[PDB]
């Protein structure tokens with residue numbers, strides 16, 4: 001359970017993401033696809049992308065980064081009270097997309113990397129630790145829902 005201070009550090013850096021959701025989403029998905037190319041196989045409209053310029057020119061990738069960050073922002077703003085936001089996400093990710101917990105770890109590392117690269121002043125060790133806790137709680141709760149749905153990914 002994060003402290004109120006930790007949630008405030010999470011939501012403070014998140015306000016910087018909200019100034020340009022699409023550009024942050026592109027940098028996060030590009031980092032995930034470049035660091036873990038096996039993840040790109042889950043995206044039918046983007047699986048052919050090779051270079052960073054191709055990834056930045058992709059309308060599908062730019063739209064999907066916004067899809068992901070819109071959902072994650074709503075989850076972070078619930079400050080751990082996110083059962084109703086996690087329920088539909090666990091449903092699709094366990095039964096349709098089949099996204100293993102290791103892939104959620106990969107995208108978490110990509111989020112932390114981009115926030116540290118773009119906003120180092122608002123992402124020092126205090127804020128990095130608070131965001132790490134917030135993404136770890138997200139993964140823990142989604143893993144338990146995955147198992148409830150019969151998915152052991």
Ligand code: HEM
Pocket residue numbers: 039040042043067068069071072088089092093097099103104107
């Ligand atoms: C922070 C973690 C993530 C969040 C908040 C997130 C959120 C979403 C949301 C809101 C959607 C659209 C609604 C739905 O189908 O549930 C979606 C679709 C999808 N997500 Fe995720 N996702 C996350 C992580 C991942 C990861 C790591 C992968 C793959 C490596 C993934 C693969 C997919 C795919 C394949 C679709 C369908 C895309 C399409 O057909 O256009 N997601 N995700």
